[PDB]
Amino acid sequence: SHKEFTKFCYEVYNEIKISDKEFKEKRAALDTLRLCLKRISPDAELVAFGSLESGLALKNSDMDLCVLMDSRVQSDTIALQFYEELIAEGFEGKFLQRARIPIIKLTSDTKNGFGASFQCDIGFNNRLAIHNTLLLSSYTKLDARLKPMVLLVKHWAKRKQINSPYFGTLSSYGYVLMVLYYLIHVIKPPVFPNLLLSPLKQEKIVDGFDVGFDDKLEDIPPSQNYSSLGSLLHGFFRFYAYKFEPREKVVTFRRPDGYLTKQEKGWTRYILAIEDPFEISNNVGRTVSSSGLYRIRGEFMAASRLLNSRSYPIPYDSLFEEA
Ligand SMILES: Nc1ncnc2c1ncn2[C@@H]1O[C@H](COP(=O)(O)OP(=O)(O)OP(=O)(O)O)[C@@H](O)[C@H]1O
Numbered sequence: 001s002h003k004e005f006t007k008f009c010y011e012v013y014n015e016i017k018i019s020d021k022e023f024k025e026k027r028a029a030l031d032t033l034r035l036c037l038k039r040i041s042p043d044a045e046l047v048a049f050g051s052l053e054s055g056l057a058l059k060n061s062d063m064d065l066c067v068l069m070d071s072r073v074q075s076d077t078i079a080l081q082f083y084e085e086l087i088a089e090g091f092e093g094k095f096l097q098r099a100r101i102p103i104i105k106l107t108s109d110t111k112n113g114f115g116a117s118f119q120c121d122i123g124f125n126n127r128l129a130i131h132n133t134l135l136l137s138s139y140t141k142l143d144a145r146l147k148p149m150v151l152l153v154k155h156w157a158k159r160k161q162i163n164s165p166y167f168g169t170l171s172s173y174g175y176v177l178m179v180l181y182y183l184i185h186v187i188k189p190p191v192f193p194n195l196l197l198s199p200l201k202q203e204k205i206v207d208g209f210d211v212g213f214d215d216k217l218e219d220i221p222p223s224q225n226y227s228s229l230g231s232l233l234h235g236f237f238r239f240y241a242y243k244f245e246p247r248e249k250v251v252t253f254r255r256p257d258g259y260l261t262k263q264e265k266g267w268t269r270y271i272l273a274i275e276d277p278f279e280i281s282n283n284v285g286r287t288v289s290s291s292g293l294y295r296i297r298g299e300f301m302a303a304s305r306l307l308n309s310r311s312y313p314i315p316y317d318s319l320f321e322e323a
């Protein structure tokens with residue numbers, strides 16, 4: 001079956017998804033921050049990426065922003081200018097620089113009324129993030145099942161304490177890639193084609209990486225997989241519990257059969273290996289510690305055992321229970 005679980009998944013889905021109210025306020029916040037960027041640099045543009053842009057936003061979602069500008073004009077200079085205007089226009093935060101990369105983190109708003117805990121990361125010419133977002137965006141437009149499946153997984157990972165990059169587990173982005181990897185290269189029939197391996201894929205080099213994928217979405221045949229949201233979620237939890245091999249294998253979008261060893265890629269941290277689609281040198285699972293992996297796997301198994309329990313009624317609610 002999975003009929004009751006599907007029903008339940010849709011019920012939690014509507015409680016966790018960003019409302020139209022929060023969405024509209026986040027979009028007003030952006031209008032504001034753009035006015036501040038105009039007063040500093042007329043030519044620079046401010047773009048959003050991440051969950052809000054792709055449509056994979058939970059409630060209480062942080063904003064991920066990037067400033068695009070002429071690469072020849074140096075980004076440490078106008079970053080600071082932007083920071084000072086944000087401060088002056090009533091924003092609180094930090095101005096930072098890891099290596100050569102400048103970052104502003106806005107932590108609060110004291111005047112324009114976007115919250116006492118308004119959280120917002122601003123980068124400068126982080127072009128790859130935009131592209132990563134385009135990819136996730138396109139997939140979301142391709143199948144109506146993706147979006148609810150992702151937010152459920154994110155909610156799950158957050159609830160199970162397995163969604164902390166700084167504490168030895170995996171980022172949200174990392175979980176989205178695992179979802180996509182499952183939907184493309186594991187489930188049969190596949191729910192999604194691999195857009196990066198499309199015959200129609202035009203090459204586009206950005207910052208040294210090929211960010212090309214097939215974006216003419218309308219021309220793509222709909223999925224010949226007809227599984228319910230529940231079925232898919234069960235398949236997902238089953239695959240990473242029992243089938244997938246973290247020690248030998250890499251989650252990839254560069255192989256037509258999704259088959260990649262850690263060794264081919266030279267990834268002997270690499271406890272969990274997820275190859276970023278475009279920034280292929282970047283391992284998204286790099287934050288996953290040894291004990292982090294144990295917990296991540298333990299949760300994948302428990303989730304499978306639950307969904308497969310014979311003790312009726314199945315306490316589906318325990319799929320989302322704190323720690
Ligand atoms: N571990 C990572 N490695 C490389 N790039 C990342 C990583 N995590 C995030 N990013 C980039 O930053 C963006 C946002 O990161 P984040 O993990 O906040 O996900 P998100 O899409 O904002 O959703 P949420 O905010 O709910 O986690 C992504 O679009 C991605 O391009």
Ligand SMILES: [Mg+2]
Pocket residue numbers: 050051062063064
């Ligand atoms: Mg974010």
